[PDB]
Amino acid sequence: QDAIQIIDENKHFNTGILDYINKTSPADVGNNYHIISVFGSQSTGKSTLLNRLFNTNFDVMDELNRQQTTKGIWLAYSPVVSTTLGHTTSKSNILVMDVEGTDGRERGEDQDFERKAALFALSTSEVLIINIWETQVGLYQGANMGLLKTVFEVNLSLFGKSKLETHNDHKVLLLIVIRDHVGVTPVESLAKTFTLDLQNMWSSLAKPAELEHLQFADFFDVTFHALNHKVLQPKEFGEGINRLGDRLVVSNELFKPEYHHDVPIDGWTMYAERCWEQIETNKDLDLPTQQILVAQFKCDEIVESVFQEFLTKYQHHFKEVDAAPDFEELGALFADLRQDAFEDYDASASRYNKAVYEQKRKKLRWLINDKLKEVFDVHAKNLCNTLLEKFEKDLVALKGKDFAVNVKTLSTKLVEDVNFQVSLMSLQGDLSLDEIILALTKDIDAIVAKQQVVELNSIVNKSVKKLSASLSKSIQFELGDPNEETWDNVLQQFKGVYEKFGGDFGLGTSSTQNQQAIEKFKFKSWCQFYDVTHKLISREKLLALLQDRFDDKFRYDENGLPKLYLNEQDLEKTFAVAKQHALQVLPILTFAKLADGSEIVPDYDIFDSKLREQFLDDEEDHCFAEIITEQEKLEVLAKFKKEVDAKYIETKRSIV
């Protein structure tokens, strides 16, 4: 005898519904039942019409004040159906859903709930009474055509899916009853119009492409019933209701099987809760008020115009890439441009929703940040490259002078000097330095690691020259007395500093390249060694070597005097001193040796052009220590006795 709210004001679907339903009619409800519901604008007399036509007891508006009355959705079982025969029980149990009216002013702006309940109803009912005033007929929003477009649409997008499966589907009947009908305009005429309005709604909706072909008739039947002014024509109203009672129970011309999705009642109670879950929070159904939606557009409109006012005003400071830059002149010109647009946007948008206005302010800020960044970046990089040059220069300008320790301060100062010089033009850190600083650091590391190769190949080189100096010289100084211990004093130096190489180096290392800083150095000694030999001693300076010795006793006495000859005994006794004094270093220097009499071999397989350019030959190895060739060797002693003896009897003329 009392109804219940299947779904209360705040969207709570009800738990005790099945229980309730079965406790109303003591009959077993099995698949013997109809679901009928009502939809329309606030206070169109719906709770009244259910009450009067089924015989329910939904509250109705007390007429003292026009106000919302039905809240949420309600369900009651119809005892009897008022018909022209008076009251009449029906075969089936008739379950009637009273749904809160649309477009009330209590909830003016959040049409949240109306859309939702309108779709439960539509989704869950065999027959839906669309309850309108005649005077809503040619209306658009006043006939709820907006609300409807939505509701149907989601209905298709959310359960026009189930089908091609041949129920007993939900075709639902759209039972459209016209209230306060005067008669002046024929219902058949009202009907034409409003079905047209519904056909149009149908073409107007978003359709998932699988269903794009689907029509309104496929999903829905429509019929009509007019009802006279209840207050001013009480009787004609009453008869009109009864006439409608006969329509559904007596003639049984309304309900058909197709509406009834054909399962026991518990199946429905379930299908409902389900249907309500999928409705209560649906993405296509979530909507912000008109106001927000309006503010959004309003605010973009401005974003663009203020921005367009930002653009061709910046196409004018920066078409020209500045000649004479200043990062405090710039970060200011920047702040100022951003200041203009804001205050102009603000002048026209602070009216609207603060949040939308705010959301849309931030959007503009970063539209103009990203146009300011472009310029910031340009200069900022123009700066790096300049500085960097100086820095590269700076490195070179201190050859090897304590590398690692100068790398440090210098590289620091760069990074620091950029950070500051460029932070002045970034607008409260709005425009980022991170990517710039990273790209700088990488650049520094690229440079040092190339200045390092230049200092590490310089130390190799400028070490091979304090070697070549002390080396090719303490050859000669040694050579003014060819001893048992020349080589004993020669490689004792050749390798006395062929190690200290050169001490550590102080550059940043490369350890396994610090180490291979030497295997060029050590290869190049074993390359210049041979080259000094093949240059100090050759066919040319060898023939020459004879006389440097030759004269010291064949033309000189006992104390540095040019020998005073005595007999041709003294003339032909000091002639043979030289024949040896011009043969007696060759065993110290034919093929070059060591105080051990064993051959000298090179550290590396040179004479081969493959190990060669890693640091920039006949049959065997045109041998390393082969200073004087195949013969060239004895081509000196074909001349030993030609020139030297063109002096022995050729200077005999001076005893006469």
Place this chain on the structure above:
Amino acid sequence: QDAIQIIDENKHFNTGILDYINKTSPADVGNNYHIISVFGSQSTGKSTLLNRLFNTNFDVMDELNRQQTTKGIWLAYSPVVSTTLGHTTSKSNILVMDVEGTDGRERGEDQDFERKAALFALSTSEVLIINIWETQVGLYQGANMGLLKTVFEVNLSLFGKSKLETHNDHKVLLLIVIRDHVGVTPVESLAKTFTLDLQNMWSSLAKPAELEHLQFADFFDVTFHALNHKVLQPKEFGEGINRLGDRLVVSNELFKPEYHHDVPIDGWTMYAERCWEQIETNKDLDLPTQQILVAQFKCDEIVESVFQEFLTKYQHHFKEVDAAPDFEELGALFADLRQDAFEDYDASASRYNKAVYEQKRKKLRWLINDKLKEVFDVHAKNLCNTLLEKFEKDLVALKGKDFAVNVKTLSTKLVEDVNFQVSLMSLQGDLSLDEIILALTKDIDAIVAKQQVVELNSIVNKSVKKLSASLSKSIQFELGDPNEETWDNVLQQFKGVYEKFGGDFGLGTSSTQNQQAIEKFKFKSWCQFYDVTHKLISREKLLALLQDRFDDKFRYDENGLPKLYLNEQDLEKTFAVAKQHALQVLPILTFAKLADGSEIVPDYDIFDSKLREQFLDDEEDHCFAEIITEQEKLEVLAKFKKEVDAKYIETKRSIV
């Protein structure tokens, strides 16, 4: 007897209005007139109510079909006013504006016109009848509360401006007549509600901050009049109208002076056209349908979710900066990510307005382009720096070998090689190469213009060494015969190749640095010249110089023989040959000269440390050509006769 449309359906304000108005009442209309208009939902019986209450002849809907009837806005002069005394002429001329009803279905979606005409009316009238059905009272959009919020708002934002100027302003009367009033609910009750609804509308509007303080009462009076069912209560309707006739003409309780903005009628005809201009196209009034506004939101919602689906799926390919890059592997992974989001966006947004959907597709594309660009850029630059290294290397690796002509092909190939290698990863040119290519070119130009300085300071250097070789050597070779023409053969070479310097160079020039490639070169000769002199001839190798000559005749004969002495006449005749043969080149070489006997001066003011480091001294100039000093000069001839004569009588011991 016929009205006219001040503004037709499509917004054309009418030209012949003043003329029309004056031709209606033969009375002179001067400031003796009222402006009264009607506002409300389609077919609320407005044209009917004007007709019945003033006695006009606006068409009315023929009841065969519910449809729009009044189109645009109309104006007619009221002959008489129906009142309870029957018909009554009034003192003032009453000008009545019939405005097309809101919310018709003929124009369902474009509320353009209704907003506009609703605001003309409100802006232009002393009294505005808001004509509603009782059954619209507790409604929101069905009571037009949306349309209104707008209309008032713009009204404030567009002419609540004029004021603080103390007219006779437009307070306008809001004359709200309730149609088909049954009586069940007291008009006073309806009134309370609906004025409340209007107060709320008032708090709900955008207000320019100057006016934020302004209230609804400041701008507007409201009163009410109920009217019974015209068809079902013809008489009570009639009496109700008459009762309203008495209200404005008999009691004269409606019109007040404050509504009347107090100027002659032509002033009004003007104020109207003006008001209509500022309305017909106003920015706050320009609006897109609900549908678009809805699609916009709908489509952003998706943009974000599809994008968020793009982001943390890319935070996953690129958190890790790739180790092993491939630009065809990449431009593909890119296209594919962009492919996913699209087809997912498309799967959910192709429903809505194509244009909004399209607009909003493009928006997503470039959201993801700009996230793809970041990665494209990274690698793309990783590529430039690698290549560049090779290129820098490549330049150096061809010392001077035809610079300009190798600069060309090499620099081309780089640019080309980048363009191609990086175009493969840009997505149909969506992501730009322009800024990359520019930054490359600048980089190339930075490098060559530094390799050039290295090749141009090398040619200076390695030219000063084929000079120093032929130079310090054809000194000595010349010096084996100190002639009248030594210097004649010495600077003839010193400046024989101190010009060809060195021929053109073939590098890219710097012309006025190609030219200053030499004013180092020419300065450094005038620097090494002096250095060779101060090194070949000094205290050391000078004392030495004596004997190189000394021996050739004091110890040698006529053909290369060591002189065979004869008498102590032959012993002390060839002793004085040397005293000169050891003094007779000094006038060829004390201070160094020219075959003219004039001093040699340097090209540059050297000995001064200021012109110095532009290419890396006592009282006068510790003179340029001062090879042997203050004395050092005669410190050789304190020893001339010590060592050389420790040989004349010291080798006299060999005649015994």
